[PDB]
């Protein structure tokens, strides 16, 4: 039968660490979905709409690993995309249509399946115009490209580019309906914080009866992301009716130095787990201290990165060892403790 | 440089083999828009026709050598094009060598779009449905003498370009 | 000939559509008259009559679009949705207006009769007002470059119609169209609009005791707005007067209200409320929302200023816990949804049977 | 400046480019060909000139 | 100017050599280059890097690599080759580029 | 501004301009077609006011 949303949860919580929310708004909307396509005969007056995210997240938090992630366990065709290559229609640059395209290569042509799927286009905050004011000049990957999306999400019929897929041999544009796939969107809307505080904090001036706060009681960049509205997005760059068409808004928060250490060993792929994989098909055993997790936890929220930032780290602290290792000889495990991760100590290699 | 051609269904035009339906209404058609052009034509083309056509700058491109003087012959598709040089118009007419290796080439499209029901070994490359647009119609229906249609088209290409000028 | 009436079919749109009546009644009218003149194909007895060409104005969320998709249904003449996004000017990659005629076609069966008595419906048409600053280098593929060849079209000219093409080529018939006959709807959300028509009809403040000073809450919608627009507005925009000129009537919707949305929740035939509750049947769950939470979900959706959608964004949020947990727990008969619910204060009650 | 930056972030993590297919051998029409950008090392290069004082 | 303007771009340079070379890469690649006014294209005081001076900063930016060495990507054609996309690939680590200007105002600040 | 009299500083004495090869219904040569300025009589006129002024 159809999988239930915790059963998918659980799949998501083998690559990704620290998001509940997140979690919870793909797994409703997978199941819906799921649901959605086998009551495809509509034997009820109703007509069934569907509801398109927003995933909105810092840097580092995993927009684009989840996307990968549902991938692995759904069955229909999905398909990833770039809004930046995007291009309003008539220009040398990608077309929105190209999208389908590259969800019919994957729906091995079969186009009820690809009637039934998921996109996901990321860097949705990079074709932002602009600012509310009029654009002195065509914004070709601006509002073009959110123009020409905005029938995609609400439903049209996309001339798809014939000769393609699995089909070498055609003339005739295929036609494809685009109502009954769900367009997960998705960016990381560095800047929008600002936007948000000048609604969430009002009375920011000078003299007696003004609000001062120091940053050291004003929110985290989280909890901003966590009171966003359709009214700061638009000062953001992005016109009305595109937010009108992403009726659901799930935010992610920033992750905390406790999230980071899960993040090392937790995960089915995590960073640790890569390093110690190079280190083991060479002929050596690598492990990492308890204790050593935790300084490089507290090193990564300072350069405000995300997970990406742990791999600086890492690569700083065994940059030397990684170099010289290789041609030493007799050795058959390394420890790294906290005190390499500072540099007042040196990895202590167990010979062997 | 246009490629003059029909690219019958199942692209069964025919070069290797002497042309099937040999109709006054397509070489009229093709001599009006190739007297004195450099037509770059191939060593398939030129069996099937052999006669020196009267103006056309013809161009065998063939990979073997050339003989002939009163019709030259190219060996390079270098050659071949320079030749022609940079005239206004090359009416590439060879072999599926020639067709397929000007393609990338090719700003314009003289084509036919006859119905011919042939077959053989002898095929064209395809054609991009949205970047080459059909600007001229003309209808030519089949006739009693003309067994299939020959309607001809012209078709080219183009795009744009932003400029994101500043102050 | 011409068996509905304007009452008839406006009872028709009412059961998709809440309000906009002025919208139903221009849209009445206009398709009346092209029946009317399909008794004697243009009303070619003596005078002529001119097209009807409307220009739909509406914030997001109005009822644009909707009613481009109820009207179909009952329509029996061929009926096809174009997006003037996707249109550039012939010769370039992009998409050419005469495709617009060929989508016609499929629905109309290739017959030129029908065809050319069908409706065009070119949404988002508030696109391609061209805004750049008269650069002159290139062209605006996606601006009044489109326009130029979209007027000559709708003003009555022969048009390139090639056949479906089932085979290689369709032998470039070409079938000449006249678009005399045929009747255009464009319409979009002219986001940006109000701010012109405001200075038109500024009244002018100052700073003294005696100036004209309102608070934002004093001030006036774009609804208000809109239905104050004239035609100078929409060449402010970035619209060619001539094409405005030749559509008439131009049609402003007004800003939905909490009555309205209220009503939209439960009466139409596809309400949101119908829609989660056919999907929370589907698998066996009964789903009750009292008029108290109703009213509470309008007044968020007001704020988020993308009318009508902005309602999937409130119950989505409200549901997204409940809809992730109720596929697992069993012994389940019958939810119901209080206004605490929406405040975000309560957790929806369970009838457990 | 910025808009070069914002193509790249999908480049060095992956994505499929498509690739105008002349010349070599690059059968497909149009069917760009899809080259998954997952383990390409990059190694960007610059002079920075001016970040001394920020770090200053 | 800038790659991306409606201006002019570096790599127009290279293709004016190919008119006079017959365009033969070979030859064009073994060249001499001489690009005057090459003081109109200095930073108006401008150190802080207000704005992006396409005119300025930005054609220097441009040449970097032109003068020392890189695959340049060639105009698509200003010669009997008729395609576009072909984008002639030369080397440029064997042609000298000469630059003269005026520095109107340099006089005191050496001074 | 200065900027604009500084390009036509070279056209007046001699330069190989390129000019797009039509208008001319297709013209044969396609090579950015070439046009020594060394030989046009460039009359540059005008309407200096304030000249009378500044010679007084
Ligand atoms: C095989 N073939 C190629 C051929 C035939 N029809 C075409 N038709 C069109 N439209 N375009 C072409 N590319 C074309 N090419 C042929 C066959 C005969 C002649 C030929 O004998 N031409 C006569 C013209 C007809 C006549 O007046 O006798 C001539 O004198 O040159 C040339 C091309
Ligand atoms: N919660 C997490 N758990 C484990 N790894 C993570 C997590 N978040 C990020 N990562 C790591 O970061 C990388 C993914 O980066 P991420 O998807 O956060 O970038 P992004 O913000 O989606 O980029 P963009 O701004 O283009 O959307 C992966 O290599 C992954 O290992
Ligand atoms: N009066 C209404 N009654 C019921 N549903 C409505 C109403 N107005 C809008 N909707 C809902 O909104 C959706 C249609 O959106 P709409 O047509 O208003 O977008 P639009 O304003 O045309 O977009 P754009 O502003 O980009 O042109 C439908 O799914 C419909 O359920
Ligand atoms: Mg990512
Ligand atoms: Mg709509």
């Known amino acids: 039968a159809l999988p239930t949303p915790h059963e998918i949860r659980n799949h998501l919580d083998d690559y990704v660490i620290g998001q509940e929310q997140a979690k919870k708004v793909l797994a409703v909307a997978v199941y819906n979905h799921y649901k959605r396509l086998r009551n495809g005969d509509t034997s009820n007056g109703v007509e069934l709409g569907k509801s398109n995210i927003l995933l909105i997240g810092p840097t580092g938090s995993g927009k684009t690993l989840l996307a990968e992630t549902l991938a692995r366990l759904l ?40 009637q039934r799927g998921i996109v996901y286009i990321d860097e949705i905050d990079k074709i932002s115009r602009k600012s509310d004011n009029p654009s002195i000049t065509r914004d070709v990957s601006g509002e073009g490209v959110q123009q020409a999306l905005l029938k995609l999400i609400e439903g049209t019929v996309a001339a798809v580019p014939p000769q393609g897929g699995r089909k070498h041999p ?5 036609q494809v309906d685009t109502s009954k796939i769900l367009f997960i969107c998705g960016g990381a809307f560095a800047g929008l914080d600002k936007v948000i505080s000048h609604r969430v904090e009002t009375g ?28 700061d997005l638009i000062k953001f760059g992005l016109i009305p009716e595109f937010i009108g068409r992403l009726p659901v808004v799930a935010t992610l928060n920033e992750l905390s130095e406790e999230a980071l250490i899960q993040i090392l060993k937790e995960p089915k792929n995590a960073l640790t787990k890569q390093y110690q994989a190079l280190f083991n098909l060479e002929g050596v055993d690598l492990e990492f201290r308890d204790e050593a997790l935790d300084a490089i936890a507290k090193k990564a929220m300072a350069r405000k990165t995300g997970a990406r930032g742990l791999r600086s780290i890492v690569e700083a602290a065994l940059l ?30 167990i010979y062997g | ?50 006669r020196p056509l009267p103006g056309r700058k013809n161009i065998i491109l063939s990979s073997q050598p050339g003989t ?40 314009k499209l003289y084509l ?56």
């Not at chain 1, 010289?324 to 495990?333: A, H, R």
């Not at chain 2, 071949?80 to 397929?100: K, L, T």
């Not at chain 2, 006739?143 to 000028?165: K, P, T, V, W």
């Open chain 1, 75 to 114: 069955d229909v065709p999905f398909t990833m995309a770039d809004a930046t290559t995007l291009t309003e229609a008539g220009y040398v640059g990608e077309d929105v249509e190209n999208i389908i395209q590259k969800l019919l290569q994957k729906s091995d042509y079969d186009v009820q399946k690809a």
């Open chain 1, 320 to 349: 030397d060892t990684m170099y010289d290792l290789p041609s030493m000889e007799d050795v058959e495990k390394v420890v790294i403790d906290e005190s390499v991760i500072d540099g007042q100590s040196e990895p202590l290699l």
């Open chain 1, 170 to 174: 055609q003339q005739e544009f295929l």
């Open chain 2, 112 to 167: 036919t779009h006859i119905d011919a029901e042939v077959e053989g070994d002898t095929h064209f490359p395809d054609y991009e449905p949205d970047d080459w647009e059909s600007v001229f119609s003309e209808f030519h229906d089949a006739d009693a003498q003309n067994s299939h249609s020959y309607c001809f088209e012209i078709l080219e290409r183009r795009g744009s370009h932003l400029g994101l000028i500043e102050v």
């Open chain 2, 1 to 50: 440089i246009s490629l003059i051609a029909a690219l019958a269904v199942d692209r069964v035009i025919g070069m290797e083999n002497a042309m099937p339906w040999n109709l006054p209404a397509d070489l009229a058609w093709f001599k009006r828009n190739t007297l004195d052009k450099p037509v770059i034509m191939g060593r398939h083309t030129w069996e099937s026709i052999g």
């Open chain 2, 68 to 107: 002939d003087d009163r019709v030259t012959w190219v060996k390079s598709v270098d050659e071949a094009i320079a030749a022609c040089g940079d005239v206004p118009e090359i009416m590439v007419i060879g072999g599926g060598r020639v067709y397929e290796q000007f393609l990338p080439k090719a700003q």
């Open chain 1, 204 to 231: 920011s001036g000078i003299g007696f009866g003004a609000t001062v706060k120091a940053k050291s009681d004003k929110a985290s960049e989280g909890e901003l992301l966590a009171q966003v509205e359709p009214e």
